[PDB]
Amino acid sequence: DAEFRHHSGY
């Protein structure tokens, strides 16, 4: 995965 996948936030 990538940074966007590893990092989550809504």
Under the rule (CB under 8 A), what is the footprint of a second copy?
A: 1-3, 6
Residues between 1 and 10 with contacts to Zn ion, criterion CB under 5 A: 1-3, 6
How many Cα neighbours within 13 Å face the side chain of 6? 3
For residue 3, the minimal CB distance to a second copy (Å) is: 7
Please say which residue, 2 or 8, places its beta carbon nearer to Zn ion. Answer: 2
Q: Which two tokens stand for residue 10?
A: 């809504």
Cβ closest to a second copy, residue 5 vs residue 10: 5
Residue 9 carries which DSSP code? -
